Amino acid sequence: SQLEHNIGLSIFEPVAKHRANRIVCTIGPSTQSVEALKNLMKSGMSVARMNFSHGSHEYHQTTINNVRAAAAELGLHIGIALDTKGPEIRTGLFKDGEVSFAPGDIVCVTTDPAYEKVGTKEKFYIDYPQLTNAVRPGGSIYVDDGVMTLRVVSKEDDRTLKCHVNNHHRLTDRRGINLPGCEVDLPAVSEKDRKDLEFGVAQGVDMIFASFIRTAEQVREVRAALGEKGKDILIISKIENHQGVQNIDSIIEASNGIMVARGDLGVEIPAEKVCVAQMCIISKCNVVGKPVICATQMLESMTSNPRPTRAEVSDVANAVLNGADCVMLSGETAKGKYPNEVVQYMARICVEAQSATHDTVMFNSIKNLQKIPMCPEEAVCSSAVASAFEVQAKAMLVLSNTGRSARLISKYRPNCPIICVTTRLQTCRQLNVTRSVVSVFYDAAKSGEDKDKEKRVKLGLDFAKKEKYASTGDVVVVVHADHSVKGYPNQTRLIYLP
Amino acid sequence: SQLEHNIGLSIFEPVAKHRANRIVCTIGPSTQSVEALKNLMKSGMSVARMNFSHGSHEYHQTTINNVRAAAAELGLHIGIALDTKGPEIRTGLFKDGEVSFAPGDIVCVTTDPAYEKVGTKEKFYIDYPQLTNAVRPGGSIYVDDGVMTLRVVSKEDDRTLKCHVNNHHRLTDRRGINLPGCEVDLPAVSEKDRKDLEFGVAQGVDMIFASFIRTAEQVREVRAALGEKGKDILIISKIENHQGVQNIDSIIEASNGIMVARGDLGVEIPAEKVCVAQMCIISKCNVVGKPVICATQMLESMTSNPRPTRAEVSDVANAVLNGADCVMLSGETAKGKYPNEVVQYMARICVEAQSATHDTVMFNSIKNLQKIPMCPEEAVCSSAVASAFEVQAKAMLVLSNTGRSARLISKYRPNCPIICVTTRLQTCRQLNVTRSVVSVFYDAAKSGEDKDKEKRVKLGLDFAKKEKYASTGDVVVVVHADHSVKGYPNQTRLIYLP
Amino acid sequence: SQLEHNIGLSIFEPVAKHRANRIVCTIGPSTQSVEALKNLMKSGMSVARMNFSHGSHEYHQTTINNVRAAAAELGLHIGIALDTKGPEIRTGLFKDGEVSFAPGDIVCVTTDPAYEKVGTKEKFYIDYPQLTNAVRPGGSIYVDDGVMTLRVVSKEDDRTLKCHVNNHHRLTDRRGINLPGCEVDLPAVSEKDRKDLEFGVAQGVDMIFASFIRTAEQVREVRAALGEKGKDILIISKIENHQGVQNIDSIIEASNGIMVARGDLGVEIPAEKVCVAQMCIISKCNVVGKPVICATQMLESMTSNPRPTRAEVSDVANAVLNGADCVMLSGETAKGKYPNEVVQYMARICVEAQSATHDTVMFNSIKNLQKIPMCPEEAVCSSAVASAFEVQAKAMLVLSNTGRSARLISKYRPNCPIICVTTRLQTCRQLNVTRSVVSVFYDAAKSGEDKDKEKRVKLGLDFAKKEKYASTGDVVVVVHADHSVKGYPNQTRLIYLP
Amino acid sequence: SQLEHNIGLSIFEPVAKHRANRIVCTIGPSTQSVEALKNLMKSGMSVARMNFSHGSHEYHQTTINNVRAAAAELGLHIGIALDTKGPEIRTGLFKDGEVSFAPGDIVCVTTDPAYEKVGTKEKFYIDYPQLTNAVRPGGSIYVDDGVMTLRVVSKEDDRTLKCHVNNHHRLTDRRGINLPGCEVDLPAVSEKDRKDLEFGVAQGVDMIFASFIRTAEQVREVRAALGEKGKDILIISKIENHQGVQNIDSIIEASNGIMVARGDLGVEIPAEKVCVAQMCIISKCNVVGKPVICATQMLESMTSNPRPTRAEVSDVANAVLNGADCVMLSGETAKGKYPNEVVQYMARICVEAQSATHDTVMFNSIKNLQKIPMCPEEAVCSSAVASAFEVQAKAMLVLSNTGRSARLISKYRPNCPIICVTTRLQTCRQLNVTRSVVSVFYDAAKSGEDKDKEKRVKLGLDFAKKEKYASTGDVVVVVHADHSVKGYPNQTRLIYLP
Ligand SMILES: O=P(O)(O)OC[C@H]1O[C@@](CO)(OP(=O)(O)O)[C@@H](O)[C@@H]1O
Ligand SMILES: O=P(O)(O)OC[C@H]1O[C@@](CO)(OP(=O)(O)O)[C@@H](O)[C@@H]1O
Ligand SMILES: O=C([O-])C(=O)[O-]
Ligand SMILES: O=C([O-])C(=O)[O-]
Ligand SMILES: [K+]
Ligand SMILES: [K+]
Ligand SMILES: [Mg+2]
Ligand SMILES: [Mg+2]
């Protein structure tokens, strides 16, 4: 039982030597140089997130180039994630750049572009043109991560709402706007998003984090936008509002993976419900073997301080115990003072949580929920993990070209590394959002066809030696096809490292 | 499985009506007035904590008096808790009142009290005579709540260690010292704590939060100092370092309760290891059925902000899911801008975690670790909770004078309120640290001795109707003695509300 | 697991001191005298079965009188069961009293009464007048517990079938006939059965074993036949053919209990399927808390030998492990040479099997299958058994007038005796088919009303002492109503024997 | 739960097509002819047992020869088993060849061989010199297979016990003696058994059924007597007394297999305790994955009758449910009237119990008791069975030369056939005592050495199609080595049938 497990825990035991969970870092001014990226990577960044809410194509092009250069210098496969603006709503500017509000303060908000740059305590601009359809008298506008709320007193005209300010707040430029439970219908893929996606395909990004996905239909819109050259890019749907949570099953089925985007989520639904949605979403993803990323304010204080709070440490540990493949940093690495240290903390916490995890509870729970009969490869991969447990394998080794077989082994949550020898660099980069997987590239053009898998296997075992996963005499659980079968693995071997 | 339970959660269903977990709030300049305390109570404070690290008896006398006036106004039983200064190691003073250190600086630290008042960059004093036995070369000394860290390079004589400064810091006079992983030997009760404990006894406080408990002997020393007149006051041992964690079993056995005091604990042991300690301590308390409080930085940012971070919301929920009876607020209510809002959030988060808890999993896990045969009162109590699940009881009712039986029922973690009818105001106040319990006071001097239980039972059932726990024709599970047995409950009845 | 349980078993441990399972003995020429009945009772007979397939009312009247006289002499409540002939089919007589058959031997069978007494190798009588409707050319008649089969070659006339004999057999007088998978529609209650039942009610029999029940409708026919004076008599339906097994759920719902009548069953369906039907039927009865009796050829060889076979011993043990309340003897005690010894064996085997049973596996399995919410009394009774386990109670004590509450405690299969104090002698006799129950009679006319239950409780505890179930200082789990509630028990006490 | 599994059984569904359990038949005058043996084999005999308690080498040579001729005619691999006379204690002779005892008679029994030939009512001889140490006053001596029992009253000298006859019996010359509960010390291999064992080795028998194994030392003595030339013959230790049961762990560890020999065992220990021994022994064998045979009186009555009793049908089914690989027939096929019918019933009952077995419960229970880490071959084998359940494989296929791997797979109790392709006729014959296994012989001398497994694999898959286990496009789970590993299987494949 969880209880009996807990009472046996020790703060005195050694921790896991190889970190299973993966860390996503948002790049910004703190972290864009090749050098800063090298150090993020050294600290434990597996994926680099470009936030296309801000910056031009040139700015992100510099991110892309710098990532590839850092990674090549270090010998790493680092994923690059394009995170879409999507249907964001913001304020315009204000005279000076701040204004200040008190409760009962009556403020007019307008969609008139003419007030964009020149906003005040009585009148300012919001860039959602359908504002006065979206929210009626009595409804509520949430401003700046929902810190200040505005009650709508009346519709003045089609362009203008008169609003009752409900509390004190310090209003900076171009702040976020949220409209919980309103008829907001903006596209999942705007004109702006469409260009950003096209740029992603051109630049060969590995995955999209698609903001504000509320339907499987919207996931497909993002797929269609990425066009023909873009079909192998992962779509991770960001769950961020009421509808996203409601439609989660079918959003999951359409997507390659999911981010719990707790930032917008905890404004869009009451903040205290985010914990329930997180547990629910992470688990649903585990059950179908699709990567899931927990995001936002995980080590937030560390944007300014050299140490995290107690809450932040448990938040990271619990995202891991919840079953998340990945944990994410946003402001902390994009614009914080301690990018490297925050990533290092997150890593150390990950490894604690991983060492606190009961070995086989996930394996069993997940297995018990799968429809029988399985397809052969899933039977191979689950039984492979089972026999890793039974022999205390220090590693597994799987040949995967698309990444499918590596994600399938990971679905069953072994307690050791999954070394994946792949024939595609993009698979190396994409498997970064999958717990436990460590990727090695086999260049089949340079080295030959490897029909019998002996070149790729040897390369995986040599990697196991060099990275100190296992030594001579240790058992490794090796998964690929036999000599005939094409398209999936049908075979498991147990192998002593030579 | 946890996993299956997760996938079946819904964020949309109504949540529990009756909050099970309890909330300790620290009093300070934000919250001390009778007014402020009324609102704290309306907001969900069950226990008021006095931090005797700071302030005179005069100050805390106001807190005591004001709490009692606030509660009497509202008709509530509110626990009062004295949280001791506790032992501490501190540096000496510095020339000119301050000194600045830089990475690489070599500093001697001495227990020669000749140096007490003349600290320099070269050399300063620490007031723990045993220093050079307790920390060996290669060990760390943390200074100023962990902010500066020294590595011990070597021992120069039996009173002097040569050290290496690890980071930039400015020290002033008499900063805190921590000796992570070190067997420290200080009195459990200092001269100051005696006076504080004598005061608490005289003013009739309900519980001690005893700082930095290292051993069971220390709990017994704190009991000894409370004397005959204080023999009924709960000792809640604060676990704040590795020794506390090492000795948890015997400490639990000696105490009435435990606080996982994460502030100091996150300084004394690596921060990532606090989550493992927390899980283990809470579970170990659950197993023996003693209240445990999770503490510190649970909602830190709300000291300044009117909404909590995502990490924070999850910290509170997980403490509840871990199995804590209580969660606690320090800074957030002592000195913060939003004392009420922060308690209200904590209440709402508690309820969400509660509502997301699988009913019976804790009950079974806890019951399966009990040694057979049980005492009869504990069979009666666990079977009472069993029967409450079997009939979906909306409430249970117990008669307890010391509060033992109420704690024994709570131990088995029913999903409904446990109404306790008691003959001691102090029991009402003390039962505030126990999950699910709601106390009603029966005045025996004023209503007769109730040998046959009938009046106390009616009082409880009336209370069930008033407080809207249950109504006419609902089954309530009622626990007390039969007509002849004294000293413990040997009887469970199921009763329909008339 | 069953496996892990088994490997821990010992042939060297002491056995249970109090036998939970109950033994039904068929009375005949070996066993009808008062003296032989005294000895059967001493050996461990709990219920006496009158087989109304044979004997007149006078003969059974002698059984009834002799049972009551034996039991009164010994101070016992012994149940009396009337087992109906029902829709039996038999042969008539033969010249001399045997004839002999060989394979290919062509035999005419007739329903013509005129051939009743005078049958031969070529022509004989079967007492089912619709024979030549029931079975067509190609069908099969099973003769003498299905030892010889006859293939029907043709219908000669409406009275006569020409048959192909399929094997060698030695044919004695008035042998049994079975017609698997034929359109046999005889009444569950014939004219003969109706008189036998009426006689049962007049004579105050405790239960009916109703032969060949194939529908819930038929159970109700037996209920209607017992008329108004007969409504409190248990109907145990004998499952004995295809249709009985098919309709088992609804037969169970209509009945008070079930016998697996393996004799006719294993002719009516292939013999090897009886093991599957037994497991299935016993378990279904366990799940609704209705008594079930395993019957027939359990110690068959002991009809002639002083020791049973190895198969017979395991058959009895496994009926007990299967969950049967009772095991039955037929020929073995009715006409065998070793009535006393066979009953003694059966008892010793019962106690072995009982001691081999895992304590709580039945409790849990049964509890997990019950619809929530339970009614209050079932919550009381299941939790009562749970707390017996938790305190290792050596006994339970329940007040039951109808027997309902005693059968409800038994449903949850405690590992100790259930002492039942009842106000009806008929409840004492009827509870003999319920595992674990030991009955004490409280005469409320002689001793007064006992509203507070103190007279009945005292009588139960005194019985516990005298029968050596528990001594002074031992805990007993006592179940009845509190001082107000009428009609079911709402209360559980744990009591130390004074 | 077993209980839930039961209630869901249906007597009407089709049963398993492929019988998993195996049937040992004893040869005798009923069954010795080549004709009789062909029919036995067609009826379901896998192993022919020779009881060397009776008959010359000449006789058993006919059995051996005839079995081999019968099998060669039918194309079957049939095991031949030599079941030893084993140790025995017997009385001396009596004056006039016989003597009659009555309850209450006092008889001296002496180990003074002066009395060997002059037994009277007053005094007779028992040929066990250690008698007066092995049984103390108050202990029993069983005479004539338990039929007569004596209580030891006292020890008269160091060679004489005064005894009390308990029941009527007639003794003749040299009756059996059993000393229930007594530490008896006889050679494991008598002078007669040597000759018998030498014979068996020379005639190439597949297995010894070694009578009355008390200790592991005895198994080793039997191995020693088999010598170098017999090192490959299975030793199946017969557990026939309390010592066998006491020492089961070490006996199991020394043996290749176990027979629960219930005949003698039911004489040596109370008969009701045989069921406990049986359950424990079968389970303990299952846990280490060695074949166990349940024996004796399983279908006793069918020695004389053409149908079995209800007890008997249940005995066989329960032995299968207990987890026995094999069940056995002695008298029933050696000397009975219905040797074929009895085997056919046993086959049909086996199949019904099999069909009623919960698929995976044995697999999980067995796997959960294995020590971690496993050997790799055992991980491969248990995970292979896992994967067979996951894909509902209709068969598994293993290459095994010694039969180790076939036993290792069977250990995990898959629900389908285990096809074993082996290079040793003797392995085929020996695998007959192992649940589920069906052997096919690959002739390496005649078809080449098959380093790459491809021919043996094809042979097995062809065999799967012919024997109708599976057809085109069904998944079969295939276990052997990869191309380099020798001595054990390290590889599992899932393969569709071409
Ligand atoms: O104060 P605790 O130790 O909880 O004991 C209370 C129990 O003991 C009893 C019996 O002594 O108290 P009471 O005498 O006040 O009625 C039970 O009724 C009651 O449930
Ligand atoms: O005879 P056992 O001990 O079962 O070993 C058989 C196993 O060893 C191997 C490998 O040595 O035999 P083989 O060399 O005959 O091919 C595996 O292929 C086979 O499964
Ligand atoms: O967009 C995000 O990542 C969020 O809102 O957390
Ligand atoms: O009638 C019976 O009892 C039987 O057939 O077993
Ligand atoms: K303090
Ligand atoms: K023998
Ligand atoms: Mg502290
Ligand atoms: Mg024997």
Domain regions of chain B by residue span: 1-18+354-497, 19-86+188-353, 87-187
Active site residue C465: no
Structure tokens at B23: 């909330």
Sort A443 into a burial class: Cβ within 10 Å, 0-12 / 13-18 / 19+: exposed
Interatomic CA distance for residues C205 and A392, integer angstroms: 67
Nearest-angstrom CA–CA distance, B366 and B371? 11
- Whole-Å CA distances, C404 to C348, C387, C437: 29, 20, 12
Nearest-CA neighbor of B338 among B31, B64, B22? Answer: B31
CB B384 within 8 A of CB B406: no
Which residue matches tokens 């204004």? A99
d(CA B261, CA B324): 13
Query: Which residue bears the tokens 């008599």?
Result: C233
Residue A145 contacts by C-beta under 8 Å, 6 or more apart in sequence?
A176, A263, A267, B307
Read off the tokens for C262.
């393996």
D486 C-alpha to center of ligand 2: Å?
Answer: 7
* Solved with: X-ray
Q: For ligand 1, pick from B378, B398, B399 the residue to mutate: most ligand atoms within 8 Å of CB.
A: B399
Structural Rg of chain A based on CA atoms: 24
Distances (CA, A) of A191 to A175, A197, A225, A407, D397: 21, 10, 10, 33, 59
Query: How far apart are the CA of B336 and the centre of ligand 5, in A?
Result: 18
**Exposure b/e, C317-337, CB count within 10 A at least 16 = b:** bbbbbbbbbbbbbbbbbbebe
Helices and strands (H, E) in chain D, number of each type: 19, 22
Q: Are strands B475-480 and B491-496 parallel, antiparallel or unpaired?
A: antiparallel
Whether chain A has a CB inside 8 Å of the CB on D497: the answer is no
Q: What is the CA radius of gyration of chain C?
A: 24
Own/partner pairs, D54-59, CB within 8 angstroms, 24+ separation: D57/D199
Q: CA D476 to CA D393: how far, in whole Å?
A: 6
| CA distances, D109 to each of D112, D144, D175, D176 (Å) | 9, 15, 13, 14
- If we measure between CA atoms, which residue out of A296, A310, A305 comes closest to residue A337? A305
Nearest CA to ligand 3 atom 2: A261
- Residues in contact with C380: Cβ distance below 8 Å, sequence separation at least 6, in sequence order: B387, B492, B494, C479, C489, C490, C491, C492
Query: In this structure, what token pair is assigned to residue C60?
Result: 């059974």
C-alpha to C-alpha distance for C319 and C325, rounded to whole angstroms: 9
DSSP D220-259: HHHHHHHTTTTTTSEEEEEE-SHHHHHTHHHHHHHSSEEE
**Which residues have their alpha-adjacent CB atom under 5 A from ion ligand 8?**
D 240, 261, 263-264
Please report which helix (H) or strand (E) contains residue D278, including its range: helix D274-288
Which runs of consecutive H residues, i.e. helices, occur in B75-182? Answer: 131-134
- The CA distance from D131 to D140, in Å, is 12
Query: Rounded CA gap, A192 and D472, in Å?
Result: 55
Among positive and negative, which fits the CA dihedral A148, A149, A154, A158? positive
Residues D407 and D427 sit within 8 Å (Cβ to Cβ): no
Interface membership of B458 toward C (CB under 8 Å): no
Resolution (A): 2.5
- Judge whether D358 and D470 are in contact, CB under 8 Å: no
Q: What is the rounded distance in angstroms from the CA atom of residue B433 to the CA atom of residue B291?
A: 6
Percent of chain A that is helix, strand, coil (3-state, to 5): 40, 20, 40
Q: How far is CA C220 from CA C52, C210, C216, C217, in A?
A: 20, 11, 6, 5
How far does A497 lie from chain B, in Å, by closest CA?
A: 34
D492/A491 CB distance under 8 A: yes
Give the CA distances from residue C228 to residues A86, C198, C201, C403, C430, in Å, rounded to whole numbers and listed in that order.
80, 11, 9, 20, 19
Whether D189 and D215 have beta carbons less than 8 Å apart is answered as: no
Residues with Cβ within 8 Å of residue A54, at least 6 apart in sequence: none
> Which of A262, A313, A366 has its CB closest to that of B310?
A262
C316, D285, D294, D298 from D327: Cα distances, Å: 19, 14, 5, 8
Within 6 A (CB) of ligand 4 lie C 211, 238, 240, 261-264, 295-296
Out of D408, D443, D456, D488, mutate this one to test ligand 2's pocket (max ligand atoms within 8 Å of CB): namely: D488
Q: Among candidates A367, A498, A355, which has minimal Cα distance to A478?
A: A498
As a whole number of Å, the CA-based R_g of chain D is: 24
Q: Which CA distances in Å does A162 have to A123, A139, A181?
A: 9, 12, 19
Q: Among candidates C146, C147, C164, C172, which has minimal Cα distance to C108?
A: C164
Asked if the C-beta of A382 comes within 8 angstroms of chain D's C-beta atoms, the answer is yes
Cis preceding-peptide flag for A373 (omega within 30 of 0):
yes
- Beta carbons of A390 and D372 less than 8 Å apart: yes
**Mutation to probe ligand 3, out of A278, A330, A332, A333 (largest number of atoms < 8 A from CB):** A330
D424 lies within 8 A of chain C by CB: no
The closest of A419, A463, A421, A417 to A436, measured between CA atoms, is A417
Q: Which two tokens stand for residue D370?
A: 């294995």
CA distances from B51 to B48, B251, B342, B429, C31 (A): 10, 22, 19, 18, 86
Topology of the domain covering B1-18+354-497: Pyruvate Kinase; Chain: A, domain 1 (3.40.1380)
Cα–Cα distance for residue pair D319/D279, rounded to 1 Å = 8
* CATH fold for domain D19-86+188-353: TIM Barrel (3.20.20)
Q: Nearest CB to C245: which of D11, D270, D319?
A: D11
Distance CA A389, CA C81 (A): 59
Q: With an 8 Å Cβ cutoff, are C494 and B379 in contact?
A: yes
Query: In the numeric block, which tokens belong to residue A411?
Result: 């679905």
User: Could you tell me the two tokens for D469?
Assistant: 């286990």
Nearest-atom number in ligand 3 for the CA of A240 is 5
Residue B444 to residue C6: CA distance in whole angstroms = 57
CB count in 10 Å sphere of residue C464:
23
The alpha-carbon gap from A267 to the nearest alpha carbon of chain B, in Å, equals 10
Write out the binding residues of C.
49, 51-54, 83-84, 90, 240, 263-264, 296
Question: Burial letters for B285-318: b for 16+ Cβ neighbours within 10 Å, e otherwise?
Answer: bbbebbbbbbbbbbbbbbbebbbbbbbbbbbbbb
A261 close to B340: Cβ distance less than 8 angstroms: no
- Beta-bridge mates of residue D493: A491, D478
- Sequence-ordered strand ranges (E) for A95-157: 99-101, 106-110, 123-125, 140-143, 148-157
**What 3-state class would DSSP assign to B217?**
helix
Q: Whose alpha carbon is nearest atom 1 of ligand 3?
A: A261
Q: Specify whether the CB–CB gap between D48 and D78 falls below 8 A.
A: yes
Gap positions in chain D, given as the residue before each gap (C–N > 2.5 A)? none
As annotated, the active-site residues of B are 49, 90, 238, 296
What is the number of the ligand closest to the CA of B54?
Answer: 5
Nearest to A434 by CA among A414, A456, A411, A416: A411
State how far the Cα of C243 lies from the Cα of D11, in Å rounded to an integer: 11
Q: What token pair was written down for D331? A: 């008298």
Q: Which of C373, C383, C495 sits opposite B392 (nearest CB)?
A: C373
Whether C238 is a known active-site residue: answer yes
| Per-residue CA distances from C350 to C41, C416, D278, D307, D425 (Å) | 16, 14, 16, 27, 46
* Orientation of helix A34-43 relative to helix A339-356, angle to 10°: 20
CB contact under 8 A, C317 and D272: yes
Three-class DSSP category at A366:
helix
Q: Terminal CA-to-CA distance of chain D, rounded, Å?
A: 39
Q: In one letter, which amino acid is C249?
A: D
Do residue B389 and residue C382 have CB atoms under 8 angstroms apart? no
